[PDB]
Amino acid sequence: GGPSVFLFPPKPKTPEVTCVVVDVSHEDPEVKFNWYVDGVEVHNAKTKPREEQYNSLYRVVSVLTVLHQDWLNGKEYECKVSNKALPAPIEKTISKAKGQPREPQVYTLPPSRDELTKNQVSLTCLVKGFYPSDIAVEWESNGRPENNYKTTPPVLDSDGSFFLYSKLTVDKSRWQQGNVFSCSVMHEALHNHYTQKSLSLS
Amino acid sequence: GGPSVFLFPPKPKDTLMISRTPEVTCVVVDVSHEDPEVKFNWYVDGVEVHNAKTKPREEQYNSLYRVVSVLTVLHQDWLNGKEYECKVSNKALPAPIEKTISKAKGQPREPQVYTLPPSRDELTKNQVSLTCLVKGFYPSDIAVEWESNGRPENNYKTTPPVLDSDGSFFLYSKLTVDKSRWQQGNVFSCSVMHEALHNHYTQKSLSLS
């Protein structure tokens, strides 16, 4: 277990910059935030009460209200979190430049030919090129939501965008019969904030 | 308020590479400012050792100290499941604090490596994604790389291990290449290092159909 930090832009429609700390250890729930604007610190940010994730680890959020005309001018906003279980403080920066939302690309991949020997096969859903990291993925089959899937946490790609993979495990018999499976993704940068990519045998 | 102890295992790549140094790290947090000294005792399967290295103390954001002791472990010792105990003594402690760590116990499971070509929808783009699914391995310590034509490929990212529904772990490694390299039929290789593999190494190729 190790904490991760994410910075969120104000939505284009009161503006706010958000620093999210996920996977805070259960022994030391305390997290200390320091906010920088072009290098000088501000103190008007307010920290939300801690939330316990499904894995007992904690999610601690700090919200900094941002001057509207300031965001138009392109000033950098820095969030520095510091925790006892942390080897060193974690720093994140966000601005209007490349803080822009990026539409995720959703690709479904059938099982490897070598996996068709096993009794179960892996249906994978690749979601790449999205910003910010907040995203939700689900699997269905003919509209019935599936239960035996797992999704990796977001991974920062080499271009500043994020990607992840979701793996649905289905019986090989169900796959070869021609069943249709769907990978659903919800994200703010998507058109209608929702898209679905289907997957089926040849 | 009260000083607590955390014990970390070695990094996965340090346990898998003969040229690296795997370390067990004992971290004492919230050490008193007027009683700052900490005495470390290290035990390997009950036998005390003395080759541990202490680091200079570091003050935190709350005016209290953090002191770290680092013990080098043998590659074969860690893989064989030897247990490492760190005992932390301090004047402000009513009694010493003991913490013990070892490699994840349970039957080691061989990773299954599956290479997945880019989706046809991505073939309209200038760069395509080459996917390496590594599935069903235990424990989670693992290392993944990409190479091609005898040279490593470095434009890849790998997800951390994820706990699967069967008690094993899986991850994905994504190699991004120019579309023309993939359309040429050039062969790419996903290499995995893991204790359960023969010679702790395997590699699966990925090429155009």
How big is the CA angle at B139 (ends A151 and A150), to the nearest 5 degrees?
A: 10
Partners of residue B172 in chain A, C-beta under 8 Å: 124, 152, 165, 167
Work out the end-to-end distance of chain B between its first and last CA atoms, rounded to an integer number of angstroms: 62
Same domain, A126 and A144: yes
Same domain, A183 and A138: yes
**Residue of A124, A148, A152 with shortest CB distance to B165:** A148
Q: SS3 for chain A, per residue?
A: CCCEEEEECCCCCCCEEEEEEEEECCCCCCCEEEEEECCEEECCCEECCCEECCCCCEEEEEEEECCHHHHHCCCCEEEEEECCCCCCCEEEEECCCCCCCECCEEEEECCCHHHHHCCEEEEEEEEEEEECCCCEEEEEECCEECCCEEECCCEECCCCCEEEEEEEEEEHHHHHCCCCEEEEEECCCCHHHEEEEEECCC
Enclosing domain of residue B90: 3-102
Same domain, B111 and B202: yes
Element (H, E) at B43: strand B39-44
Instruction: Scan for tokens 């894995």, then name that residue.
Output: A55
Same domain, A103 and A87: no
Same domain, B148 and B187: yes
Q: Which among B46, B80, B102 is the end of a domain? A: B102
One-letter amino acid of B137? F
Cis peptide before A10 (omega within 30 of 0): no
Q: Which among A98, A119, A147 is the end of a domain? A: A98
Q: List CB contacts of A143: < 8 A, sequence separation 6 or more.
A: none
Q: Which among A98, A121, A149 is the end of a domain? A: A98
Same domain, B54 and B92: yes
Question: Structure resolution in Å?
Answer: 2.3
Partners of residue A82 in chain B, C-beta under 8 Å: 60-61
CATH number at residue A89: 2.60.40.10
Same domain, B117 and B92: no
How big is the CA angle at A102 (ends A99 and A108), to the nearest 5 degrees?
A: 145
Residue A82 Cα, gap to closest chain B Cα (Å): 7
Same domain, B179 and B128: yes
d(CA B138, CA B50): 31
Same domain, B55 and B128: no
What technique solved it? X-ray
Same domain, B25 and B81: yes
Same domain, A58 and A116: no
Residue A4 Cα, gap to closest chain B Cα (Å): 12
Same domain, A193 and A109: yes
d(CA A95, CA A75): 6
**Residue of B29, B114, B176 with shortest CB distance to A114:** B114
Number of independent structural domains in chain B: 2
- Chain B positions contacting chain A at CB under 8 Å are 4, 6, 27, 29-30, 60-62, 66, 112, 114-119, 121-122, 129, 131, 133, 135, 155, 157-160, 162-165, 170-172, 174, 176
- Nearest CA to B157 out of B183, B117, B130, B178 is that of B130
Residue B59 Cα, gap to closest chain A Cα (Å): 11
**Residue of B122, B129, B160 with shortest CB distance to A153:** B160
Residue A157 Cα, gap to closest chain B Cα (Å): 7
Q: List CB contacts of B98: < 8 A, sequence separation 6 or more.
A: B85, B86, B87, B88
